[PDB]
Design a protein around this ligand. Structure first.
Ligand SMILES: Nc1ncnc2c1ncn2[C@@H]1O[C@H](COP(=O)(O)OP(=O)(O)O)[C@@H](O)[C@H]1O
Ligand SMILES: Nc1ncnc2c1ncn2[C@@H]1O[C@H](COP(=O)(O)OP(=O)(O)O)[C@@H](O)[C@H]1O
Ligand SMILES: Nc1ncnc2c1ncn2[C@@H]1O[C@H](COP(=O)(O)OP(=O)(O)O)[C@@H](O)[C@H]1O
Lengths: 28, 442, 418, 443, 436, 111
């Protein structure tokens, strides 16, 4: 069977999102 | 590029039966030395034996370093050829034995087999999660081709390579997994809303099709000294460029030798030995010769080629005179190639080839007078006069060198022998060995 | 149809072979003669143990440096693991030297002389040497005239840590060199720029020769902490040594803060980012492999360390592709266990010596392990090959298809003369 | 196939069980009395009872002294430490030559230690730090403790850590889903790699994927280590391997040789003696070989007379090729073998005799079959005649140009014409010297 | 303790002397040399009295005549807690220290300061450890039951002792030592309960032990100089300690001696092959002996009327006349047959070699003819020839076999002069070919 | 002899605002979509639309309204030249140096 993906934990960390139409930047 | 002394020599000029042609690959004459050098070339190409000393001996201006560059040019790529002079061993931060050990270990190449994976496609989404201070970085990369799509996981080096040469969700990138290289090939999405803080004019490439991930076998050659310097301390890769490798301990070298034999045993690596060329080998101390005599007997030893232009002269560090400036222990374990002086036709062919390399057109009578002055004086003087005569002929606005141009070049620029003659009639004008000089003209 | 396979000794196998040869003090002829005849049997048992697999003579384990330590060890809803590594060498110091030479008291003048030499007769003091400070501020461009007194009375590592790139005024004597001007442009510059590529020789040489996938060749032999100085009867000595060995500023500098703690400090406590302790000053290693001196055992060296196991791994692929059923023969059970765990690593369908008709009925099972009626076998293999015909004849007797035997032999050992 | 370099046809002394040297055994031809003396020396080293015993191998050039040194090294085996050295290696620009000699003296001593190790290992399940009350207090850390949960086969253990261990844990760059390995002796952490319990094909960091470790999380294992006394001295002089700041910054500084004091060596000796007395360690004394001992000056010799009298000194084998020569560093002292008479009184000299025509011929025979070459009988006679006329080494090296010249004519066998062609192409010392004496401009 | 194989001076345990400082013919491993042993005994009493400072004594004689043996006898007769420094003449030509600085460090390693202090320690066997923790672990309470063979007690513990017991994991049945003022706890081992092993302590649990320290003046100089730590005493990078801190250490040591907190224990510096120093070193040594904190310097040399280094003239003993004017000289003499045979028998007894009488006579004869060291070298290489034929006692044939296999000075010299064309001479000439 | 083309934006800052997105993400504050920065120089004024990742460099170089800055094209990576000369005498005692307002247009490509 298909093995589960590794857990992803991003707590208290900024984020930079880059998409086709719009770029975000989430800050604290 | 630019024109050097041995820019006309590309190879050794030999047949399949190791027989020299009279004129081939920029080399003319010197048949026996070229045949012996071809034998040494096949000895290196076999890779079976280790630690052979070859001595090249002859008078000056005969073709010693010409033979060395012929061997290096016929040796091919990926085989190391370390060329040092006799005076580079003396250092203020390295001992003589340490410098010779590093010169020995620079001439042994380790060819490593590496399995890599290549990923090319269009970037769909980049998510980057960083800490507040910006030290810890993690994220995800969403890449696509025509048929496939896969969300990957990134680490610190991938985000560092992604922020450098910024990719912007629609660029086409190529990822090398083993070398860690991010290469931007172009842009295909053609996003309408571009907040132009930049003057990017990126190429319009097609979106690639087929498999996203592809395996590939690569090969790269590294030296034994480079593995030692990398494994010596924490920042040895910098010391491969700054030369801050101060007296690497012996334990590092034993462990590197054992690990290299282990890598040979799994078929991951192989050992490609090369040639170390020591020019002007008479400028070495007796301790260096005593070290070389026992450093030639190791498993990882290259073929050592030495060039000497000296007769029965004093060995450095001692008070006795020995043949070739070398002690008899070093001469016992060496095979000597003897190089001979030239005729006039060889000098003419040398001057014609050196004129063809410098793109300088010579007349017939200019060639005969340059041949005559290269026979009476040395050959290097007549080779040096060619560019000067070309500039003299270019002053008169004609693109051919005549007898008048080379005659003016001979008048303006002096030989050695005419300089000795002019100094010896005017010894009062020049400062002697005792410090006396007459400066006043009356 | 008898096939013999020869493989050369590996480096480790030759190492324990030479150790066993040098151990019994040069009596190899009688060893070989009475090994061929079949006390001395216990002497040649080690020889065939080395010739089979080097793990029987000595099992390979974790490769680490020798720890020159005395620490808190166990003599056997959480547990505490506290750092307690020390050095076995102790330097003993009397209390009198400390109390009358390093600590201030009423009968000595440590602090008075320290103040006189460091504050009063300091030549960067603006209370007495204002002209020198003004001259130096015109020279350097420092906005403060107390900078030189601060620099001259602080240690170097602290000066490296809290160094901040503050602005300096233009009307000064300090400059920008062309090397620094070349350095500052390519700090954030992308690829394919001419200046950027001319200033990035080392990274291109790193990425061309594949240096993030190379292996570590050297590790140290002994690792040892600093020599522990003890003074009997003094808490001050212990506090001073703990402050020097575990200085919080440098220890924080060579580490980093966790991200959730940074979130709790910035948001839940209102500490600005400029007030955070400086962190992340440790140099990056070359690879992931270069970060530590401990090397774990790998299941790629386990195959290659035995020439017989390597040759059998190469031989098993062709028999797997041709779809036969292979019989492997042994003499001991330790090698039986070793080959069982190797086969479970390779995940081959195998059974170990009600099993007979299971072997004939099911064709999915590939390797049968046996120790010295199986008509379904096609290829029989002698690992520990002995040329006694009494055992070999019955081993081929218990084995319609073509029957091929294989013998794994090692060059230059007891088996080659066998 | 395999590589050879002026040796590796020598596998040992080739003695019997009574110490009698057979004529052609072990790759050795002749030198029977020297081989017997070296065998007695090998037994003396194996006796493990004496200290500071020195021999000298005295003879001419190309007579078999280095061959005897590697024969002694192969007879003693890989367990016994053997330290080869040329006399030019003692002159270091970093430290004085006395310290280099004493460093090699301590390097020629072995030690086999059985060391126990406390190991925590497993796959990281949780990673949760707890915060301090006042992070900006100046004294103290930002965190107080970190809870790490490790799981393995038949086990799951919850660990509470001090900050000093967790600094090393985060320096190894662990994450949730990582198999780690913690050493309790020094605080070292090794991150093995990713666990295979999750997906594999979704990474970009060329990682290696390991299964869950066997056994319990907390372990005690026994490791046999092979160290030298120089390793202990170097590891104590420049300390690394602790998690404290001074050892933490000792890894980043550029290494440099220093003058190790006598006090440190005495303390290291005391620790090793306490290890031996508890039945843990075992002492393996070894051999130091100094080839070309005539390159030493009078200061290193005068220090050798003091360093030989220590109660921990190894067996030191010297080699010379000197007649009645002046010692370096002196002007008027003339001594046998270039070695001063205050040291010669403490040596035992072993003579090494030259060869005959038959010995030269059979040495060429073994060097031919080791290099994988086939020679005719007449070519072998011509090579032996050359070896008597000029040198044994010159006849030895001329084999591979003859093999190349035989292969280039589509042949395997070496004939007389190939030897004559290699005679013409390559010269020796005597012919080149005769060309040098009769030459125009210092050829 | 003090691992050692066999040394050349391993049979010397001291000077064999009576209560009237008279030498026995054979005692404590020393035979012969009666006047030299008497002079060394007078020098030993001079060191033991400790009322004089900085006097130089030269031991001079022919080679292989008991000089380093006399130094070893003095060093063994001094015993422990008195400094003995032994350097060679080539040990001060360093690359990071000057010659006078290295000589000053060698001088100051030979003077000690004796300090007696008392510290209170607790040692015993752990019976039961109870530790109670809260939910957050902020406050911890504990009890410790410990015992000796004479008493048992229970202790209420605080927080930091609980943390120092959790670290360095202590279970029941371990023998531990606790220092209260420093918080240092060392596990001595485990007791006699098999179910390392040491005995249970006896007597009082709370004991005051007086420990006698001896610290050299070089150590206090390195510690008081703030430019380097105490780790330079082990690594060896002190780097030209300034003079001023040496005056402060001298004044503080004089103050401690006047107040009664310390006493000076002077020692001996031994310089072997003293002729290999330079003229600057001799000039420094001339004035370094006139200090109150100066040891007694023993110098050994074997040269006679040779060139003094750094000069171009020749002097007796290789030393200039100013240094010889400040010295008293002990002269060693050559040995006889009986003393040679007694030395050979003592050496053979120390190497566990059983010798026949005739083998001993052959060794004595070849020691008189050639050298004492050559016979002492053959006396242990003949045992392996004896054990090769599977016997215990070394007989005459083994000694003859060792004499044939291993050469001495004179035979090797004879073979070199009879075959001089096969060796490399001063002119770099050699003949390696056999024919022509 | 190396030749290069630099495209650069410089001038006095008239406005400096981070624009919030249409739909904010939970768990964060200040989800920015673009940063609007207005530049003013001699005979010129131009308002720019920038990446949100220029805002951390804005906070890093401590750029407020009134300072003169220096924006190069491909890298972003602002750096504060100084304060304008028109704001020189707002305070009696201060340090921020005062450089003149730049000449030419705010957009220039120089070789
Ligand atoms: N056979 C040859 N073929 C090509 N060039 C040659 C030849 N002989 C000499 N030269 C030229 O003559 C010059 C002298 O060569 P060099 O190696 O310096 O001689 P030597 O061995 O005497 O030092 C070189 O610049 C080389 O280009
Ligand atoms: N007795 C011997 N048997 C076989 N080969 C020998 C013998 N003696 C010398 N050789 C060979 O001759 C060469 C020179 O010997 P070596 O011992 O290195 O020089 P030296 O005798 O000057 O120390 C070596 O390559 C060695 O293989
Ligand atoms: N009187 C003696 N008693 C015992 N052993 C002696 C005596 N004299 C010399 N020896 C021994 O002789 C050996 C060589 O003498 P040594 O003292 O080294 O000569 P030197 O006086 O030149 O230093 C030493 O091992 C020493 O133990």
């Amino acid at each position: 069977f298909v093995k589960p993906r590794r857990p992803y934990n991003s707590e208290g960390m900024t984020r930079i999102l880059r998409r086709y139409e719009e770029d975000l930047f989430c800050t604290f | 590029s630019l024109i050097a002394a041995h820019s006309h020599i590309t190879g050794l000029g030999l047949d399949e039966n190791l027989q020299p042609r009279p004129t081939s690959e920029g080399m003319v004459g010197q048949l026996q030395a070229r045949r012996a050098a071809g034998v040494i070339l096949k000895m290196v190409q076999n890779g079976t034996i280790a630690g052979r000393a070859v001595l090249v001996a002859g008078p000056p201006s005969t073709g010693k370093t010409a033979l060395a560059m012929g061997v290096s040019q016929s040796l091919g790529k990926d085989v190391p050829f370390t060329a040092i002079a006799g005076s580079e061993i003396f250092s203020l931060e390295l001992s003589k034995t340490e410098a010779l050990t590093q010169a020995f270990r620079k001439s042994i190449g380790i060819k490593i087999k590496e399995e890599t994976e290549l990923i090319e496609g269009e970037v769909v989404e980049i998510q980057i999660d960083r800490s507040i201070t910006g030290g810890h970085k993690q994220g995800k990369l969403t890449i696509k081709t025509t048929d496939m799509e896969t969300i990957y996981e990134l680490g610190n080096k991938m985000i560092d390579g992604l922020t450098k040469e910024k990719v912007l969700a629609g660029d086409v990138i190529s990822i090398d997994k083993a070398s860690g290289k991010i290469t931007k090939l172009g842009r295909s999405f053609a996003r309408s809303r571009d907040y132009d803080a930049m003057g990017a004019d990126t190429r319009f490439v097609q979106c690639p099709e087929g498999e996203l991930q592809k395996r590939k076998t690569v090969v790269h050659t590294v030296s034994l000294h480079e593995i030692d310097v990398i494994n010596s301390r924490t920042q040895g890769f910098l010391a491969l460029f700054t030369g801050d490798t101060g007296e690497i301990r012996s334990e590092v070298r034993d462990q590197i030798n054992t690990k290299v034999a282990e890598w040979k045993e799994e078929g991951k690596a192989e050992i490609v030995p090369g040639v170390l060329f020591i020019d002007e080998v008479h400028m070495l101390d007796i301790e260096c010769f005593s070290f070389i005599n026992r450093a030639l007997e190791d498993e990882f030893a290259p073929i050592v080629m030495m060039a000497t232009n000296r007769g029965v002269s004093k060995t450095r560090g001692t008070n006795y005179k020995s043949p070739h400036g070398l002690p008899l222990d070093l001469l016992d374990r060496s095979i000597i190639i003897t190089t001979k002086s030239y005729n006039e036709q060889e000098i003419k062919t040398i001057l014609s080839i050196r004129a063809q390399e410098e793109e300088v057109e010579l007349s017939s009578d200019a060639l005969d007078l340059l041949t005559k002055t290269g026979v009476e004086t040395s050959l290097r003087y007549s080779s040096n006069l060619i560019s000067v005569a070309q500039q003299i002929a270019m002053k008169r606005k004609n693109n051919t060198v005549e007898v008048e141009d080379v005659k003016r070049a001979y008048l303006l620029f002096l030989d050695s022998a005419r300089s000795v003659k002019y100094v010896q009639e005017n010894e009062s004008q020049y400062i002697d060995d005792q410090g006396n000089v007459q400066i006043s003209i009356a | 149809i008898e096939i013999d396979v020869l493989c050369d000794l590996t480096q480790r196998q030759a190492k324990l072979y030479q150790v066993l040869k040098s151990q019994i003090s040069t009596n190899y002829d009688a060893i070989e003669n009475a090994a061929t005849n079949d006390n001395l049997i216990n002497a040649v048992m080690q020889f065939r143990k080395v010739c089979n697999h080097p793990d029987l003579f000595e099992r390979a384990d974790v490769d680490s440096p020798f720890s020159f330590t005395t620490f808190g060890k166990t003599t056997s809803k959480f547990t505490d693991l506290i750092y307690s590594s020390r050095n076995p060498i102790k330097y003993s110091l009397p209390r009198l030297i400390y109390e009358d030479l390093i600590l201030p008291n009423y009968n000595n003048d440590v602090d008075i002389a320290n103040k006189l030499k460091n504050v009063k007769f300091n030549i960067f003091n603006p209370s007495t040497n204002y002209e020198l400070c003004l001259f130096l501020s015109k020279l350097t461009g420092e906005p403060s005239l107390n900078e030189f007194f601060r620099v001259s009375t602080t240690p170097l590592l602290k000066r490296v840590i809290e160094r901040t790139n503050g602005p300096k005024n233009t009307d000064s004597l300090s400059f920008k060199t062309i090397t620094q001007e070349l350095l500052e442009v390519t700090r954030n510059a992308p690829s394919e720029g001419v200046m950027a590529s001319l200033l990035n020789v080392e990274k291109h040489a790193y990425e061309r020769e594949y240096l993030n996938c190379i292996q570590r060749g050297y590790h140290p032999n002994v690792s040892a902490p600093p020599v522990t100085i003890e003074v009997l009867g003094s808490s001050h000595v212990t506090n001073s040594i703990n402050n020097e060995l575990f200085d919080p500023l440098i220890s924080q500098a060579l580490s980093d803060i966790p991200a959730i703690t940074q979130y709790n400090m910035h948001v839940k406590k209102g500490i600005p980012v400029e007030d955070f302790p400086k962190t992340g000053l440790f140099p990056e290693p070359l690879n992931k492999n270069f970060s530590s001196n401990i090397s774990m055992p790998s299941m790629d060296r386990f195959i290659t360390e035995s020439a017989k196991l390597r040759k059998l791994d190469e031989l098993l692929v062709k028999l797997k592709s041709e779809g036969h059923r292979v019989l492997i023969y042994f003499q001991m059970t330790k090698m039986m266990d070793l080959m069982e765990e190797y086969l479970t690593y390779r995940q081959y369908n195998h059974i170990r010596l009600d099993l007979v008709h299971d072997w004939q009925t099911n064709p999915e099972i590939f390797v049968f392990l046996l120790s010295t009626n199986l008509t379904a076998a096609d290829t029989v293999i002698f690992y520990d090959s002995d040329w006694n015909p009494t055992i070999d004849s019955q081993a081929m007797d218990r084995a319609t298809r073509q029957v091929t035997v294989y013998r794994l032999l090692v060059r230059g050992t007891i088996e080659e003369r066998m | 196939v395999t590589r050879t370099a002026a040796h590796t046809h020598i596998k040992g002394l080739g003695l019997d069980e009574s110490g009698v040297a057979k004529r052609v055994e072990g790759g050795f031809v002749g030198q029977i009395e020297a081989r017997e003396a070296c065998g007695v020396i090998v037994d003396l080293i194996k006796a493990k009872k004496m200290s500071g015993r020195a021999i000298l191998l005295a003879g001419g050039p190309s007579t078999g002294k280095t061959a005897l040194a590697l024969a002694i090294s192969q007879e003693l085996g890989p367990k016994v430490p053997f330290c080869p050295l040329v006399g030019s290696e003692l002159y270091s620009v970093e430290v004085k030559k006395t310290e280099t000699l004493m460093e090699n003296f301590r390097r020629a001593i072995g030690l086999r230690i059985k060391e126990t190790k406390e190991v925590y290992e497993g796959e990281v399940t949780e990673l949760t730090p707890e915060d301090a009350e006042n992070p900006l207090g100046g004294y103290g850390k930002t965190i107080s403790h970190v809870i790490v949960g490790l799981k393995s086969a038949k086990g799951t253990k919850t660990l509470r850590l001090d900050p000093t261990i967790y600094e090393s844990i985060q320096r190894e760059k662990v994450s949730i889903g990582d198999v780690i390995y913690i050493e309790a002796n020094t605080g070292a952490v090794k991150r093995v790699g990713r666990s295979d319990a999750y997906a594999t094909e979704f990474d970009l960091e060329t990682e290696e994927y390991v299964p869950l470790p066997k056994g319990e999380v907390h372990k005690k294992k026994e490791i046999v280590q092979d160290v030298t006394l120089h390793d202990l001295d170097v590891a104590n002089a420049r300390p690394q391997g602790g998690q404290d700041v001074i050892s933490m910054m000792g890894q980043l500084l550029k290494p440099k040789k220093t003058e190790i004091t006598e006090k440190l060596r005495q303390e290291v000796n005391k620790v090793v003696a306490k290890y031996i007395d508890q039945g843990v360690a075992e002492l393996i004394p070894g051999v130091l070989f100094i080839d070309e001992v005539n390159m030493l000056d009078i200061e290193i010799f005068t220090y050798l007379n003091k360093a030989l009298e220590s109660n921990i000194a190894p067996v030191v084998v010297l080699a010379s090729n000197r007649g009645m020569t002046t010692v370096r560093g002196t002007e008027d002292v003339i001594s046998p073998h270039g070695v001063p008479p205050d040291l010669i009184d403490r040596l035992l000299i072993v003579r090494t005799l030259p060869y005959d025509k038959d010995e030269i011929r059979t040495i060429i025979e073994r060097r031919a079959t080791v290099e994988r070459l086939q020679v005719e009988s007449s070519a072998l006679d011509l090579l032996a005649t050359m070896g008597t006329e000029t040198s044994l080494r010159y006849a030895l090296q001329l084999l591979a140009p003859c093999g190349i010249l035989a292969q280039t004519s589509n042949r395997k066998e070496i004939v007389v014409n190939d030897v004559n062609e290699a005679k013409l192409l390559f010269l020796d010392a005597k012919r080149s010297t005769k060309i040098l004496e009769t030459s125009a401009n210092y050829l």
